[PDB]
Design an enzyme around this catalytic site. Structure first.
Site, short mmCIF file in Angstrom:
data_model
loop_
_atom_site.label_atom_id
_atom_site.label_comp_id
_atom_site.label_asym_id
_atom_site.label_seq_id
_atom_site.Cartn_x
_atom_site.Cartn_y
_atom_site.Cartn_z
N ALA A 1 0.82 -1.21 0.00
CA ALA A 1 0.00 0.00 0.00
C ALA A 1 0.85 1.26 0.00
CB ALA A 1 -0.93 0.00 1.21
N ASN B 1 -6.80 3.34 10.90
CA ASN B 1 -6.11 2.18 11.44
C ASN B 1 -5.96 2.24 12.96
OD1 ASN B 1 -4.31 4.38 10.57
ND2 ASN B 1 -2.67 3.12 11.44
N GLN C 1 -7.56 -0.41 5.51
CA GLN C 1 -8.31 -0.90 6.66
C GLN C 1 -9.72 -1.35 6.31
OE1 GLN C 1 -7.24 -1.42 9.78
NE2 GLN C 1 -5.18 -0.87 9.08
N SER D 1 -3.74 -3.41 0.71
CA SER D 1 -2.57 -4.21 1.07
C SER D 1 -3.04 -5.58 1.54
CB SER D 1 -1.75 -3.53 2.16
OG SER D 1 -0.38 -3.91 2.09
N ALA D 2 -2.45 -6.64 0.95
CA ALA D 2 -2.96 -7.99 1.18
C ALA D 2 -2.77 -8.44 2.62
CB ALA D 2 -2.27 -8.97 0.23
N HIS D 3 -1.65 -8.09 3.24
CA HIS D 3 -1.33 -8.62 4.56
C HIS D 3 -2.23 -8.03 5.65
CE1 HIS D 3 0.78 -5.28 6.70
NE2 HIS D 3 0.88 -4.81 5.47
N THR E 1 8.82 -7.86 -12.80
CA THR E 1 8.28 -9.21 -12.90
C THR E 1 7.19 -9.42 -11.87
OG1 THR E 1 10.47 -9.99 -13.61
CG2 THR E 1 8.86 -11.66 -12.95
N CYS F 1 -6.82 12.49 22.74
CA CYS F 1 -6.76 13.67 23.59
C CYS F 1 -8.11 13.91 24.26
CB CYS F 1 -6.32 14.91 22.80
SG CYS F 1 -7.62 15.65 21.79
#
Lengths: 388, 386
Positions: free
Chosen positions: A73, A155, A183, A203-205, A241, A328
């Site tokens: 990402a 996140n 997220q 993002s895959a992970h 690749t 806060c």
């Protein structure tokens, strides 16, 4: 560590055994280069086609749209921001970017570097619900704004942004809309047509795929100068690749993420709610952001007796993995004290404990975490000379 | 019938023990290395061991940086565009020297830099398929920002005199980057003896996984990040670490150096057998001198046939190979030869690239010789002029 419990799923997730099995052949039994013309190279073509189909299906992209596979990402965000800077700012009438204070560092640092290039960047601050509303974005959009980049879901807090209305006001103003949707996948319904976004990073992970592979959705194949020039990979938009294991695994993981969405909304939400109610039973604890607008797996708790980092270290000693978030003090309309989301750079920011579940979280883990959290809060408040 | 992979310059099989070294870091060890908890830090010894393996395999020093990228293409884009930003857009320079024979990640980046107003010299390549040092010295200007010359060519296997190019680069105070993707596992790689400032590499070229590469930066030299954001890789390349990729790349580089020292003769000997057998066919020409070629590569031009038709017929026979650009010329003795050429040249024809690995067997080689002869005669009875 009397029990090992992973509650840091917003930072990364375990690779689903089914994703690992889908990837397994594409290391040594099927290893040809997909760009080669011989049978060794083309052997993996059906798998790549199925993975691309899975990605298009999981986010509701149409055929005219592009989904370009990146390495992460971070690459996607750098690509969007720098490409729009190159196309519309260095070579257009624009010089202005609108974003938020709570964005991921791959957005904020890229934006600070673009500021170093003379780009005007408005870092919109976040409201008491932990999001930025559409009318604010409209208030800050002028005729020289090139792009609006507002993350889909946060996140740290899990707060879901009103991406559809932001896209409505962007379309009215003819301004490109990118969202960091990392997220979002596997946690909330994701339809890039209904969100109206022009660009989307993922993002895959973050949804039980492997690390080292991400994606950028581009609506209608909109032009955006390549970050990686060279070979004609990915329709000539991103060279290098193809990460065949990563691509297969990301497609499988996105399919699984779409399947488990109902399970994450039911069971994972129930376990999150149990953990959050149990924690909030402790005096002087405050959950950041409304649950009703939050991803079903996330809690961000502020405790006024203990520090966040020491709390995290105690939790790790009990075998529990969690993280941090910035918060806060403020007050609601009745003026009752609450803790709200804040940018990390803020003077007013203190550290809160972020606990993030997955579809693999069990009620045993939740009960153990409740017990260890109460024990840690009591231990760290019992040493303080100041806590009342 | 028999399926035989001889396109190892395009990609290679992941070594089984490299796959075994990678295996735990998907589902058994999955924490984020940037996390502070035990789940995250569990993979730290493996990452340190992999970085050590990389530093050892290329002879990098401790003061030097080795930044993990996603692929050699990212490394090349990073070097070229970062030096453009540092010394050209924000300096007094405007010139880059490179070759016509570079990989597309170099040439296309350079064409885009030309679009940015950068003057780029694509140095033509000589009858040995390389560019000599004195040419680079002749082309270095007072405004030259970078010299980017690949270590070894992927089509011909020709090894470039990178050490002497670096000598003259240091003399002129010009930074030297090399695309060394074809070098690792095929020739001795010592970044201190090559004197290069930047070096790109890719794991899947030496039996590591796809999707992981590296950029060697000599002596921590400044280079503006291509991937801003997270404070990863010493702040030089952001993004969550490809932990399986990193572990596997380290293991693969260690294995590549081990098999370079231990089994140079096996791969070299089978390449020599196949090449001698093929050149025994009439009107065949091997592109580039063997004495300056990587030990695993052959590039054969067959008179009468198209390189593509040869590739297709070999593929129908189960043999995987690729192509390379060449054209007819003559040596000083005046006999006819085939020399390396840029693909874009009007005079270029297609030749057959055969590239071995340490996994190639003698049965594969004998089968390939037989089937190559069979294909040459099959397609030559089809030729309109031969």
């Amino acid at each position: 560590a009397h029990m090992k419990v992973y509650l840091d799923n917003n930072a990364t997730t375990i690779v689903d055994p089914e994703v690992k099995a889908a990837m397994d052949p594409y290391f040594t039994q099927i290893y040809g280069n997909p760009n080669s013309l011989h049978d060794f190279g083309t052997e993996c073509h059906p798998a790549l086609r199925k993975a691309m189909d899975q990605m298009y299906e999981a986010i509701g992209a149409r055929d005219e749209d592009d989904i370009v596979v990146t390495s992460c990402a971070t690459e996607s965000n750098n690509w969007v921001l720098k490409g729009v800077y190159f196309d519309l700012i260095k070579n257009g009438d624009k010089d202005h970017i609108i974003t938020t204070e709570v964005e991921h560092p791959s957005v904020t640092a890229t934006c600070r570097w673009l500021e170093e290039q003379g780009v005007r960047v408005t870092y919109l601050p976040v409201n008491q619900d932990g999001v930025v509303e559409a009318h604010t974005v409209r208030d800050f959009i002028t005729d020289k704004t090139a792009l609006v980049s507002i993350m889909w879901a946060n996140n740290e807090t899990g707060a879901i942004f009103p991406v559809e209305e932001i896209s409505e006001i962007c379309k009215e103003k003819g301004v490109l809309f990118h969202t960091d949707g990392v997220q979002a996948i596997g946690k909330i319904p994701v339809d890039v047509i209904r969100a109206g976004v022009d660009f989307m990073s993922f993002s895959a992970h973050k949804f039980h795929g492997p690390k080292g592979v991400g994606g950028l959705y581009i609506r209608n194949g909109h032009p955006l100068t390549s970050l990686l020039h060279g070979g004609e990979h990915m329709g000539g938009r991103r060279s290098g690749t193809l990460n065949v294991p990563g691509i297969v695994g990301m497609g499988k993981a996105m399919e699984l993420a779409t399947y488990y969405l109902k399970f994450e909304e039911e069971h994972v939400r129930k376990l999150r709610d149990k953990l959050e109610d149990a924690i909030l039973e402790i005096p002087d604890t405050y959950s950041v952001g409304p649950r009703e607008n939050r991803t079903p797996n996330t809690i961000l708790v502020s405790v006024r007796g203990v520090e966040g980092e020491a709390m995290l270290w105690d939790l790790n000693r009990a075998g529990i993995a969690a993280s941090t978030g910035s918060a806060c003090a403020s007050e609601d309309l009745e003026a009752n004290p609450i803790m709200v989301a804040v940018g990390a750079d803020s003077e007013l920011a203190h550290t809160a404990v972020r606990l993030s579940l997955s579809r693999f979280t069990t009620e045993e883990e939740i009960d153990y975490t409740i017990e260890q959290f109460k024990k840690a809060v009591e231990r760290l408040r019992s040493i303080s000379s100041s806590y009342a």
